[PDB]
Design a binder for this molecule. Structure first.
Ligand SMILES: Nc1ncnc2c1ncn2[C@@H]1O[C@H](COP(=O)(O)OP(=O)(O)OP(=O)(O)O)[C@@H](O)[C@H]1O
Ligand SMILES: Nc1ncnc2c1ncn2[C@@H]1O[C@H](COP(=O)(O)OP(=O)(O)OP(=O)(O)O)[C@@H](O)[C@H]1O
Ligand SMILES: Nc1ncnc2c1ncn2[C@@H]1O[C@H](COP(=O)(O)OP(=O)(O)OP(=O)(O)O)[C@@H](O)[C@H]1O
Ligand SMILES: Nc1ncnc2c1ncn2[C@@H]1O[C@H](COP(=O)(O)OP(=O)(O)OP(=O)(O)O)[C@@H](O)[C@H]1O
Ligand SMILES: [Mg+2]
Ligand SMILES: [Mg+2]
Ligand SMILES: [Mg+2]
Ligand SMILES: [Mg+2]
Lengths: 254, 107, 254, 254, 254, 107, 107, 107, 107
């Protein structure tokens, strides 16, 4: 019912990590969720969802009609509310039409509660189709001068190039999320603080996720990091999903 | 009429032996797909998708020196990497064949 | 005369960091160099080249003919062999034709010795035009399972989708470069070693660049990190530039 | 309905590790399971089940009647068929009556399909109450001369000291399981092979579980090792659970 | 004259290995020593002392009076100061009274200098009688989260449940000994370091004994590992006995 | 009539200040439990179970220098470590008090 | 048009794949000879004579899982078992190819 | 006739072993210079200038436990700290020797 | 007058620097013995017998990069390998010196 896209503009900020984390966090809460890997030809989401060996059909098959949406969705083993529509490696991002992705968004919206769209990097056509049919958007930002500038270009593209911008509905509800935030390096002054990003971008923070070795360990064993509750980042990911559902929480780990 | 691929078949690549066999003498990186309507011989470490006998032939075969495929499929009957790890001969010299309607995994 | 593109596929690995470093390393050697920011609409190179206040005309002005190539090139202040053709923020990556970028590469090849092409992330049209007219290609890789898979997809596109692949000349000479390599995390096993990347990708390493706080400190003050020779990364960047020029050097900092 | 005890005799062979693994393996299959930590006063199961922060009431509260069986059972967060009845640290193993544990086993058998009994070490009263009401018994063995002698003493106590031995029903169905089997040390001759244990103990092996760093890594993050399917031990634990359910599988990793 | 018990709580940490090692190390120094296997019914000490073929009478015979203490003690062949009172396999740990073991401790204290008591695992009655008449206690600990928690329960039982705690003498002098310590795995973070155990338990380390293949080889040929001085563990065992006799030595092999 | 415990309160131990307060000036290992029908002051790293006001007194209080308890409970209203880690002031100097029927966690 | 031989190729027998490849999925006894003008793939223990590319094709190849042939020859350039035993890869998975005018023995 | 320096050789200091070897068992602070017409052994962290074989001897040697010198020079052929950082064995146990006309840096 | 030995000093060999120092730049096999009445510097893995200051000089020193000697002795006061293995700095860069009447083992 609610299509929210994880986007950034600047590559490598952690979109897939956040997409898998928030996609699992909303399935633990109980909502029947799907995550759509939109990085066609350069797939990455099924690798850190631990779903890479079960993939038979992918995102570009459903568009071209070589399989159905029930044939391509991968039910998880640990969660029953979580499904993943992984992408291909052969065909690149021109093999996704705006019309073909519209059909998949329609019948995904009938069955599921939350649709998480792991956008690829940049401001090009693969990053535009993830943006397009979205209702909300989480913008991922590193606390650094480049990633705030290039995440600012993105918030202006979730206000003009959307579908709710060309059809005149209410605009996309935007959310900011600082990833791989190093609290020790913001006191040395070589990173932006949590309030400089809240001032330059001038929106409400969904949360601040610290630098963690648990993030690389979790993707190395196939699990999202919100299913690792002993660490600091897994806590910080599991509060940002509550802040998605209105429940205001004071930020920690800073 | 037996197409030989002597280079590394990197991820995202697809090789299509249109007439008959396909011999791959290098490593096939994960994400690559090798499809041929005859047999497929992989004499390197295969980590991609082997699709043998693609145009309707239940007598095609797949031979790998190291079974690490993401998917093997003869004439349509596939077998993903999830249940191939469960059997033995994972990472072993393997010989895939279609007996009627099920895939076999020999050593 | 020698167009080499810095590419990766996986975003955020350090392409702009490597592009500014290798482009400066070749100007310190004496070669008259230019660096072209190809990330049109999401520019980042002029920010870490320290040239952001001097930009008047950019890459997309030269293409559309709103300025000349001498009106847009920015001579450095510290180096005389180094020039920068920065990109825009207004127009995105569809405003670059294959024909329009063909003309700029032609008259850049008459004046300059080395052309460094800071590729954007992905396998889309902005990453294809940087790939196209290239003679060599440095592929940037983080020592992690995801960044090796997506740098593997890239080497198969620098062998088929090039200009020397559709016209049948000798193919692009490819080079591997591990960035933000953490020697301590490869012994814990959560990153790939220097030999796992040399085995899976199966090419010759241009070098291995350690994790450093000097890289974020240098881009925060406007300087490339190869002009910071006291650090560990500045050393390792200045040896990969010698390895580009044939001089074989034993790898350090591992 | 089926009470099976994980026992050994020799301490430290991996009973708790096997108990949490086989108890989770049967919940992934779909059976509504409970695991009872019988090591009262020296509890370890909730620590590697990841349930240590949710424990309010334990095994010895249900016995003394300080709580109900629904007030003490801990539903898992990742599995819905898996519940844990943890033990205490204050009161030691004399606070368990044969009559008090008889009542808890009675009303556990009404609700659950599989009851896994994590036996403490030794041949004393805490190891006798787990043995007593059992229907099957997994004996855990290290491939070493000492751990086979003391797993041999155990099979003679699951044939005489049981409840189905003093009441004359069919005896306890016993299963052998080699844990932390090192395939490289059995060729040097300093450990027993898979057939020496099958000959001296003279029963059918449920499986052989290799030496793995994944077992200590999983208990350090709160997860059972059967929920880590990338490793070698997680595979070998998930085949012994199929061998518990009749499905014969050829042994691997030897 | 000095009854010291080797205990742990957590089974399999290496109590018998340490008991045989420290029992031999104090006989090499010259003290007339005896080692009492207290694991009645599940005997293990005579197997790794190499004394298993010479056993005629055992620990439970001396208690029941079926033999004398000179008839049951086994003088070693390699040492003249070392004797072993092995245990039974038939009768379990209820066949040891507190009063019957008191008589054997009395006449052992008249003839011998050091009495080493290899405690069985757990916090039950067999582990209580080894604890009871002790003057000092070596607590064995693996550098792991469980073995430190369950060795902490043990230090609180050597302060309240002793004989010098119910009769009000000076309490048992406690000593900590980390066994099968893997120095390589404490840098990966999956084991506790030597200082985390010195902080959580908060006592003085008797020594740190590395992981060694020499330990399994020595028990496979019948010899204690302190009689194997070529290895790393045999060194580390022979320094812990000097640290028992006041001579402070800097810890090695870490 | 204020019992002072100057030794480490090791796991499995239980200390019961029967009349009033209980001051623990050492580290309380996980599994230990400190219960008293007055207040409880823990001036070390507490990792055990603090049970204040056990014989019916809703005015008792718990004071820790480092909040890492497995359970805190005043007069019966408890709060396990699972939902205490979720709040801030975990590992911080904390002051637990019972307001009517809910526990408070101040800094 | 790729002849598959699934039976043991006993001594004295000769199999002639006249058009292209020849796959032998069994053991080839000493004295047997397998000759084909394409490639030859032997996925058993070969102890006979493999003769690849017999009608003039220097791009044929021989693949054995266990190199124990009495003779290997591509397009006429042979190599008897006497000097094959001297090299490594005897009894090993081997890949024979004709480079210009000499035979190669890869592993 | 082997002069031993057991104190820290602070900056600005100069030590001159006039006859033969020079052994420095302490740290040589940056700016210090140690010159001797025999060998130079530095068993501390050297950060100064080592000048071995100063009176014409191409067989002198420098041994440092930690190579951090500002300059090393045997019989006149020097090597400043700028190009010593570029090679490996910077901060490593090193052994400097003059082969004909160039300096060598062993580990 | 500082004898340099650049070859491996094999077992059974004895090198005698008669005037002063002795520098051995290779591995000294077990059973070899190096004796000199000045200092001894061994920049390889020493496993033999180092005998410093043999003609009465309590100011001699032994320096090894890897302490694995069977015997070290300055001016007569020895220290066999049995009690050297017991100390730390076995296999470590070590510096032996005679303080009055006892040997010292520094790192
Ligand atoms: N909170 C964090 N702390 C530490 N490291 C992180 C964090 N989030 C992500 N990372 C690391 O940063 C890298 C970013 O990769 P990721 O795939 O998440 O980027 P992305 O959002 O997908 O961008 P792209 O699509 O260009 O790859 C990963 O290798 C991950 O291990
Ligand atoms: N060698 C290194 N060590 C430590 N950090 C590094 C290194 N190289 C780059 N980084 C950091 O990683 C981040 C990568 O940003 P950068 O702009 O270089 O990526 P990129 O190659 O441009 O990829 P993209 O074009 O998608 O942004 C930067 O913030 C930089 O500070
Ligand atoms: N298959 C395995 N491979 C490697 N290590 C293992 C394996 N199984 C268990 N271990 C390790 O051995 C140790 C045994 O501890 P565990 O608590 O499992 O023993 P147990 O069966 O509970 O015996 P006890 O009840 O006496 O502690 C653990 O530290 C664990 O990390
Ligand atoms: N320092 C060590 N390094 C490597 N392995 C060890 C070490 N100490 C013990 N072990 C191994 O661990 C196992 C522990 O067995 P041991 O009988 O010593 O335990 P324990 O102290 O007697 O506990 P339990 O009484 O429950 O058996 C033995 O098989 C031994 O080979
Ligand atoms: Mg991504
Ligand atoms: Mg860039
Ligand atoms: Mg247990
Ligand atoms: Mg024991």
């Amino acid at each position: 019912a609610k299509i929210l896209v994880v986007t950034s503009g600047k590559g490598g900020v952690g979109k897939t990590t956040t997409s898998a984390a928030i996609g699992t966090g909303l399935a633990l809460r109980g909502f029947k969720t799907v995550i759509v890997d939109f990085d066609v030809g350069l797939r990455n989401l099924d690798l850190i969802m631990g779903c890479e060996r079960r993939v038979v059909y992918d995102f570009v098959n459903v568009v071209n009609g070589e399989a159905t949406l029930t044939q391509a969705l991968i039910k998880d083993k640990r969660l029953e509310n979580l499904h993943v529509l992984a992408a291909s490696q052969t065909r690149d991002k021109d093999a996704l039409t705006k019309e073909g992705v519209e059909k998949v968004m329609a019948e995904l919206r009938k069955d599921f509660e939350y649709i998480i769209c792991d956008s690829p990097a940049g401001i090009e056509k693969g990053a535009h189709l993830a943006m397009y049919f979205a209702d909300e958007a989480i913008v991922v930002t590193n606390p650094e001068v480049s990633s705030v500038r290039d995440s600012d270009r993105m918030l202006g593209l979730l206000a003009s190039k959307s579908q709710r911008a060309e059809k005149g509905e209410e605009p996309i509800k935007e959310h900011l999320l600082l990833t791989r935030y190093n609290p020790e390096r913001v006191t040395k002054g070589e990173m932006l603080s949590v309030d400089d990003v809240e001032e330059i971008l001038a929106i409400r923070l969904l949360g601040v996720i610290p630098e963690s070795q648990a993030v690389l360990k979790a993707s190395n064993q196939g699990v999202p990091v919100i299913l690792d509750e002993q660490s600091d980042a897994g806590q910080a990911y599991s509060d940002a999903v509550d802040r998605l559902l209105g429940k205001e929480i004071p930020h920690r780990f800073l | 009429p037996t197409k030989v691929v002597k280079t590394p078949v990197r991820g995202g690549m697809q090789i299509y032996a249109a007439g008959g066999d396909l011999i791959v003498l290098a490593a096939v990186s994960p994400g690559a797909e090798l499809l041929a309507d005859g047999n497929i011989h992989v004499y390197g470490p295969m980590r991609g998708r082997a699709l043998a006998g693609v145009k309707g032939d239940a007598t095609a075969r797949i031979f790998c020196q190291q079974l690490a495929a993401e998917l093997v499929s003869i004439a349509g009957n596939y077998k993903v990497a999830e249940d191939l790890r469960r059997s033995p001969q994972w990472g072993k010299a393997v010989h895939v064949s279609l007996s009627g309607d099920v895939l076999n995994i020999t050593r």
